[PDB]
Amino acid sequence: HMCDAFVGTWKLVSSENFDDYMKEVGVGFATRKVAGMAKPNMIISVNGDVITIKSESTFKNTEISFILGQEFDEVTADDRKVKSTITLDGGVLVHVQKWDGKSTTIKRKREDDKLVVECVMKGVTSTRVYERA
Ligand SMILES: O=C1NC(=O)N2[C@@H]1CS[C@@H]2c1ccc(Cl)c(Cl)c1
């Protein structure tokens, strides 16, 4: 029952500062433009100890499956090859990606009827809000 309130199909409804987050990450111009247009659906499911988070969009589709606290390989939508670890901290999913000596953290939280995704690269934060699809 760990992540019950995250499970479901979610649609992006707002974004703030994502272009500046992507710049800080190192994403190039053309990818930022096309990635910034996308309105993804995020599909979260749980089977036993395995959590799956899928993103379906016109830009890229991504999918990760993982066990909390257990590092895995991830290919991001912008084609970084990163080493990821996801934990639950006080009801918040905390996703840390490491690559080329860099790090970025993505937090996913339930707030009212929304799922809020906060992405931080150094001093730059983007907030992306999802509602049930
Ligand atoms: O809303 C989201 N759901 C995800 O998996 N996303 C966004 C924020 S962080 C990650 C992403 C997507 C595209 C690019 Cl280009 C980058 Cl750098 C990061």
User: Within 13 Å, how many C-alpha atoms sit on residue 32's CB side?
Assistant: 13
The angstrom resolution of this structure is 1.1
Structure tokens at 64: 């990760």
Q: How far apart are CA 54 and CA 65, in angstroms?
A: 9
**Where do the H-state alpha helices sit in 12-128?**
18-25, 29-37
Query: Which atom number of ligand 1 is nearest to the Cα of residue 60?
Result: 13
Contact 13, 129 (CB under 8 A): yes
Sequence-ordered list of residues with C-beta below 8 angstroms from that of 66, at least 6 positions apart, any chain: 50, 51, 72, 84, 86
Cα separation, 56 vs 130, whole angstroms = 13
- Ligand 1: which residue has its CA nearest to atom 12? 77
Closest approach atom of ligand 1 to CA 128: 1
Fold of 4-129: Lipocalin (2.40.128)
For residue 63, the Cα-to-chain-centroid distance in whole angstroms is 10
Distance 93 CA to ligand 1 centre (A): 15
* Pair of tokens at residue 101: 């000596």
The letter for the amino acid at 76 is T
